[PDB]
Design a protein around this ligand. Structure first.
Ligand SMILES: [N+]
Length: 218
């Protein structure tokens, strides 16, 4: 595998978004990876609707702004036969009525999704080499909330509660890192992104390797 991977350099990452107070990061993350795979496969980068997942994708324990799971985001897209764009069904940071006319308007599709073997940074690295990957990490501590720059090393636990997207990896000064796209606007981290310590074992830094998944588009 390569020593550096950055999906931004390949035109496969939409500009940073901001989720506000709604706890819909599960949607932010699933959408970011679907945007990525769509670019890779079709050659065109389109910003997709997190709002549609929040409003129309409620299922089991995935309940809009109340929280949910990345995989239920992928499953919504699969079961619906597609997803609409950010421009057509814009984000409001609220739990709303699913707009069915907009739900029926489908521009991008995926075929299935896969889970990366949990707690295995090598398997995660391999997956990131081919496409952006969705992950969840423990973002509850102030160190995470306060992050402004550098390769973050913690402190943080491994009981995940915030979904984000890995868009690459690299090494600098002998220190391996993952490049993470967050949905907290460009005013958090390095213009909206974070570099976080890689190859630490087990669940990874802040549990970043404990529950990865990615969409598949043949
Ligand atoms: N849709």
């Amino acid at each position: 595998l390569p020593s550096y991977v950055d999906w931004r350099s390949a035109g496969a990452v939409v500009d940073i978004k901001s989720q506000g107070e709604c706890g819909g990061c599960w949607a932010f993350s699933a959408i970011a990876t679907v945007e990525g795979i769509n670019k890779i496969t079709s050659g065109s980068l389109i910003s997709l609707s997190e709002q549609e997942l929040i409003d129309c994708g409620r299922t089991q324990n995935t309940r809009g702004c109340d929280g949910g799971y990345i995989t239920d985001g992928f499953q919504f897209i699969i079961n619906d036969g597609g997803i609409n764009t950010e421009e057509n069904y814009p984000y409001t940071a609220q739990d709303g009525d699913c707009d069915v006319a907009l739900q029926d308007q489908k521009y991008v599709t995926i075929d299935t999704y896969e889970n990366v073997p949990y707690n295995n940074e090598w398997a995660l690295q391999t997956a990131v080499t081919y496409q952006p990957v969705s992950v969840a990490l423990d973002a509850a501590g102030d160190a995470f909330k306060q992050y402004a720059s550098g390769i973050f090393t913690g402190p943080c636990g491994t009981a995940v509660d915030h979904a984000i997207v890995i868009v690459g990896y690299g090494t600098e000064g002998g220190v391996d890192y993952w490049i993470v796209k967050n949905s907290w606007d460009t005013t958090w981290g390095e213009e909206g992104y974070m570099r976080i310590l890689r190859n630490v074992g087990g669940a990874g830094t802040c549990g970043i390797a404990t529950m990865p998944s990615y969409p598949v588009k043949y």
